[PDB]
Design a protein around this ligand. Structure first.
Ligand SMILES: [Zn+2]
Length: 257
């Protein structure tokens, strides 16, 4: 029964998931004045030309857009990674107000929201096996600021009314995640964790430096979702972000000078 409230939010998660106080927790603050440029880092390869979305789902904590990951179709490679990671889903974290919502922060700056594109290492065969490995997942994180609309987001925005409450899902085919990417693939990278329970330390994080812009109208539609199920007291799905966790014995490495 974890969530984002007073009584079940991030500060409580350690009770059911003790790794919440582990050595490689996410998100973190990205200090741009101490992250070092790493010339050994490679350009990120994002190959989403054959990505096939299936469906969108409200899970009571965010919504997930899902992909058919049965074929080698939508993959992330290069960057800091060895081998090939397959896209399984994306989701967002966002705020009640534009001044908060991101999980990672940049010199303590909070963005209005953050997109996570989740990929599993094909060497482990499926997602469930991958999350048991320190190099099992690669998550591409992209900041959202409020300004111009993102045309490529509008298809997601316009299905949310059909998945208002926890447990509702809808068919969601042919969505192109390339429409959610900024121009630059410059990134920061570090080893960390899932940012929701079970908080497993299985993620190579790749956080893009350039945010995308979405409109106030687009974010407002996110904020009309509900954490609760149909026929339960209404609690708006807002502030579904975990705050920055201690960096501990990690370095954040920059792909760019
Ligand atoms: Zn996430």
């Amino acid at each position: 029964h974890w969530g984002y409230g007073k009584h079940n939010g991030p500060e409580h998660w350690h009770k059911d998931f003790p790794i919440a106080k582990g050595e490689r927790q996410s998100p973190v603050d990205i200090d741009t004045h101490t992250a070092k440029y790493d010339p050994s880092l490679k350009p990120l390869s994002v190959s989403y030309d054959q990505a096939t979305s299936l469906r969108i789902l409200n899970n009571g904590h965010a919504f997930n857009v899902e992909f058919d990951d049965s074929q080698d179709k939508a993959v992330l490679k290069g960057g800091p990674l060895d081998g090939t990671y397959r896209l399984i889903q994306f989701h967002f974290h966002w705020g009640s107000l534009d001044g908060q919502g991101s999980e990672h922060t940049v010199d303590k700056k909070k963005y209005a929201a953050e997109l996570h594109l989740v990929h599993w290492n094909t060497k482990y065969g499926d997602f469930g096996k991958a999350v048991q490995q320190p190099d099992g997942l690669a998550v591409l994180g992209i900041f959202l600021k409020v300004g111009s609309a993102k045309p490529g987001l509008q298809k997601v925005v316009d299905v949310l009314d059909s998945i208002k409450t926890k447990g509702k899902s809808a068919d969601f085919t042919n969505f192109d995640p390339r429409g959610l990417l900024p121009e630059s693939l410059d990134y920061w990278t570090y080893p960390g964790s899932l940012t929701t329970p079970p908080l497993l330390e299985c993620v190579t994080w790749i956080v893009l430096k350039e945010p995308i812009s979405v409109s106030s109208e687009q974010v407002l539609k996110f904020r009309k979702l509900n954490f609760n199920g149909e026929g339960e007291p209404e609690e708006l799905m807002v502030d579904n972000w975990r705050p920055a966790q201690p960096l501990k014995n990690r370095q954040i490495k920059a792909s760019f000078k």
